[PDB]
Design an enzyme around this catalytic site. Structure first.
Site, PDB file in Angstrom:
ATOM      1  N   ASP A 112       0.898 -12.952   1.824  1.00  0.00           N
ATOM      2  CA  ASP A 112       0.612 -11.826   0.979  1.00  0.00           C
ATOM      3  C   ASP A 112       1.420 -11.001   0.056  1.00  0.00           C
ATOM      4  O   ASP A 112       2.385 -10.933   0.480  1.00  0.00           O
ATOM      5  CB  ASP A 112       0.474 -10.808   2.304  1.00  0.00           C
ATOM      6  CG  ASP A 112      -0.460  -9.698   1.825  1.00  0.00           C
ATOM      7  OD1 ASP A 112      -1.002  -9.654   0.939  1.00  0.00           O
ATOM      8  OD2 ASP A 112      -0.864  -8.837   2.890  1.00  0.00           O
ATOM      9  N   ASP A 143      -4.890 -11.264  -3.229  1.00  0.00           N
ATOM     10  CA  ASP A 143      -3.552 -11.454  -3.053  1.00  0.00           C
ATOM     11  C   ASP A 143      -3.342 -12.007  -1.545  1.00  0.00           C
ATOM     12  O   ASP A 143      -2.337 -11.748  -1.104  1.00  0.00           O
ATOM     13  CB  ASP A 143      -2.779 -10.225  -3.164  1.00  0.00           C
ATOM     14  CG  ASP A 143      -2.903  -9.249  -1.961  1.00  0.00           C
ATOM     15  OD1 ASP A 143      -3.503  -9.558  -1.140  1.00  0.00           O
ATOM     16  OD2 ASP A 143      -1.923  -8.568  -2.061  1.00  0.00           O
ATOM     17  N   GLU A 144      -4.213 -12.396  -0.768  1.00  0.00           N
ATOM     18  CA  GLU A 144      -4.038 -12.908   0.523  1.00  0.00           C
ATOM     19  C   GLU A 144      -4.528 -14.347   0.673  1.00  0.00           C
ATOM     20  O   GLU A 144      -5.381 -15.101  -0.274  1.00  0.00           O
ATOM     21  CB  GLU A 144      -4.918 -12.189   1.455  1.00  0.00           C
ATOM     22  CG  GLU A 144      -4.138 -11.371   2.084  1.00  0.00           C
ATOM     23  CD  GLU A 144      -5.180 -10.758   3.122  1.00  0.00           C
ATOM     24  OE1 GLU A 144      -6.034 -10.967   3.803  1.00  0.00           O
ATOM     25  OE2 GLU A 144      -4.753  -9.369   3.348  1.00  0.00           O
TER      26      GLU A 144
HETATM   27  N1  LIG Z   1      -8.397   1.315  -1.449  1.00  0.00           N
HETATM   28  C1  LIG Z   1      -8.464   0.443  -2.428  1.00  0.00           C
HETATM   29  N2  LIG Z   1      -9.119   0.609  -3.625  1.00  0.00           N
HETATM   30  C2  LIG Z   1      -8.821  -0.185  -4.627  1.00  0.00           C
HETATM   31  N3  LIG Z   1      -8.234  -1.321  -4.487  1.00  0.00           N
HETATM   32  C3  LIG Z   1      -7.444  -1.598  -3.364  1.00  0.00           C
HETATM   33  C4  LIG Z   1      -7.720  -0.598  -2.208  1.00  0.00           C
HETATM   34  N4  LIG Z   1      -6.917  -1.165  -1.074  1.00  0.00           N
HETATM   35  C5  LIG Z   1      -6.315  -2.201  -1.633  1.00  0.00           C
HETATM   36  N5  LIG Z   1      -6.799  -2.493  -2.805  1.00  0.00           N
HETATM   37  C6  LIG Z   1      -6.337  -4.012  -3.686  1.00  0.00           C
HETATM   38  C7  LIG Z   1      -4.976  -3.559  -4.637  1.00  0.00           C
HETATM   39  C8  LIG Z   1      -4.053  -3.818  -3.803  1.00  0.00           C
HETATM   40  O1  LIG Z   1      -2.667  -4.031  -4.400  1.00  0.00           O
HETATM   41  C9  LIG Z   1      -4.441  -5.097  -3.334  1.00  0.00           C
HETATM   42  C10 LIG Z   1      -3.769  -5.939  -2.527  1.00  0.00           C
HETATM   43  O2  LIG Z   1      -3.293  -6.197  -1.423  1.00  0.00           O
HETATM   44  P1  LIG Z   1      -3.325  -4.825  -0.276  1.00  0.00           P
HETATM   45  O3  LIG Z   1      -2.862  -5.107   0.846  1.00  0.00           O
HETATM   46  O4  LIG Z   1      -4.626  -4.321   0.006  1.00  0.00           O
HETATM   47  O5  LIG Z   1      -2.440  -3.839  -1.035  1.00  0.00           O
HETATM   48  P2  LIG Z   1      -0.812  -4.114  -1.405  1.00  0.00           P
HETATM   49  O6  LIG Z   1      -0.493  -5.047  -2.680  1.00  0.00           O
HETATM   50  O7  LIG Z   1      -0.202  -2.782  -2.128  1.00  0.00           O
HETATM   51  O8  LIG Z   1      -0.322  -4.485  -0.154  1.00  0.00           O
HETATM   52  P3  LIG Z   1       0.979  -4.065   0.692  1.00  0.00           P
HETATM   53  O9  LIG Z   1       0.996  -3.050   1.520  1.00  0.00           O
HETATM   54  O10 LIG Z   1       1.823  -5.374   0.970  1.00  0.00           O
HETATM   55  O11 LIG Z   1       1.871  -3.587  -0.657  1.00  0.00           O
HETATM   56  O12 LIG Z   1      -5.826  -4.890  -3.087  1.00  0.00           O
HETATM   57 CA   LIG Z   2      -0.359  -6.979  -0.441  1.00  0.00          CA
HETATM   58 CA   LIG Z   3      -3.206  -8.400   1.456  1.00  0.00          CA
END
Ligand SMILES: Nc1ncnc2c1ncn2[C@H]1C[C@H](O)[C@@H](COP(=O)(O)OP(=O)(O)OP(=O)(O)O)O1
Ligand SMILES: [Ca+2]
Ligand SMILES: [Ca+2]
Ligand SMILES: [Ca+2]
Length: 341
Positions: free
Chosen positions: A7, A105-106
């Site tokens: 991730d 991203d997973e």
């Molecule tokens: N509510 C949302 N609206 C739009 N895009 C989103 C939302 N939630 C997540 N995403 C998108 C953007 C995030 O960077 C992407 C990839 O993984 P995600 O787990 O959701 O967030 P992240 O990359 O910030 O994870 P982490 O907690 O590890 O930083 O998914």
């Molecule tokens: Ca992520």
């Molecule tokens: Ca993720």
DNA sequence: GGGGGAAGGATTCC
DNA sequence: ATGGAATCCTTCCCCC
């Protein structure tokens, strides 16, 4: 079976940092501007610098600025993060034949026919992290276990820029210590239905009478949880296939007027079709978000592929069916194409 | 009774 | 308080 879940850390934001490392260190918030008023819209995500103050995915941009008015606010560039993502996925595709791309991203990797015990998994974990970091300057969290679900849970526990192993022994403990609201696929709605059933931990599903579960959350969700609780959950890793493509846009002002909405809807169609690329769909659904953020939709499946012309005409029909079947004013409007031939 | 579909909605999550 | 997509549930329908 060993699963290694990967991730990427705060992806959208980390990528913006990649394309301009001057950002690193400062609060970075990737926004989705709805264009209704100056800063209207929500946060797609933000880096940990900004997140430590409450600024996170989902909250209104306006709420983010009131907290971190000096943070750097960037518009979401989905296409860019998507291409960076692909490259990294290809990278992973080299550590295993068996790869499931869960999201942008997973991805889960079946490294069974590539490793003995968890020690070799751990190393492979680092070895992969390193690779991706050196190749794309992107940090990611790695989770490893016997099945996907736990592999993911492992990563969540080690975020960010982490790596963790949940061996069969710890799997036993979590099935008793883990709050079931932390089980993937268990959102607030299911959480509260499980709370009213006395099930706070995975194992609690073992007490309850099956038929009772199936009635409160559903058979699928019931069987799912029970499997995890029995330490018998074991779904295979498989290539996921895009089953639908579509776009939904927010209207400047909220309408209920056909002619006012149309242009927005047509734009959703055009872009949707471009995203179809080579794909020809047999089903089309018109989706609308009413003023009180409720979601109403209408669709139709054709005994053949839908051309852009056919989608235009039909889309207007389905929208009209929505305007006459619901009284609320429509806030957002869009299309969804599916059942690709 | 039950094997399909299709449609509209509910939930979750990235 | 944006926006994209999978999965599952309930209901209706057609018909053997
Ligand atoms: N509510 C949302 N609206 C739009 N895009 C989103 C939302 N939630 C997540 N995403 C998108 C953007 C995030 O960077 C992407 C990839 O993984 P995600 O787990 O959701 O967030 P992240 O990359 O910030 O994870 P982490 O907690 O590890 O930083 O998914
Ligand atoms: Ca992520
Ligand atoms: Ca993720
Ligand atoms: Ca949860």
């Amino acid at each position: 079976m060993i699963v290694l879940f990967v991730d990427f850390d705060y992806f959208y934001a980390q990528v913006e940092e990649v394309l301009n490392p001057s950002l690193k260190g400062k609060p970075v918030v990737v926004c989705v501007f709805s264009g209704r008023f100056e800063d209207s819209g929500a946060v797609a995500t933000a880096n940990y610098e900004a997140r430590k103050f409450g600024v996170k995915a989902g909250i209104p941009i306006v709420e983010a600025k009131k907290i971190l008015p000096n943070a750097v606010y960037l518009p979401m560039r989905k296409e860019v993060y998507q291409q960076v993502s692909s490259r990294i996925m290809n990278l992973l595709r080299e550590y295993s034949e068996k790869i499931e791309i869960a999201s942008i991203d997973e991805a889960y990797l079946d490294i069974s026919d590539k490793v003995r015990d968890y020690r070799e998994a751990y190393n492979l974990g680092l070895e992969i992290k390193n690779k991706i970091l050196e190749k794309e300057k992107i940090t990611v969290t790695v989770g490893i276990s016997k099945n996907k679900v736990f592999a993911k849970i492992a990563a969540d526990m080690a975020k960010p820029n982490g790596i963790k192993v949940i061996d069969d022994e710890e799997v036993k403990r979590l099935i008793r210590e883990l709050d079931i609201a932390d089980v993937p696929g268990i959102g607030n709605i299911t959480a509260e239905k499980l709370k009213k059933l006395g099930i706070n931990k995975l194992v609690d599903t073992l007490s309850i009478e099956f038929d009772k579960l199936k009635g409160m959350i559903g058979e699928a969700k019931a069987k799912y949880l029970i499997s995890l609780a029995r330490d018998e959950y074991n779904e295979p890793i498989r290539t996921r296939v895009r089953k639908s493509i579509g776009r939904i846009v927010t209207m400047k002002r909220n309408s209920r007027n056909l002619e006012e909405i149309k242009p927005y809807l047509f734009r959703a169609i055009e872009e949707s079709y471009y995203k179809l690329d080579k794909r020809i769909p047999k089903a089309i659904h018109v989706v609308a978000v009413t003023e009180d953020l409720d979601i109403v939709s209408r669709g139709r499946t054709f005994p053949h592929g839908i051309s852009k012309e056919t989608a235009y005409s039909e889309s207007v029909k389905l929208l009209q069916k929505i305007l006459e079947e619901d009284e609320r004013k429509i806030r957002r409007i869009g299309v969804r194409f599916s059942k690709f031939i």
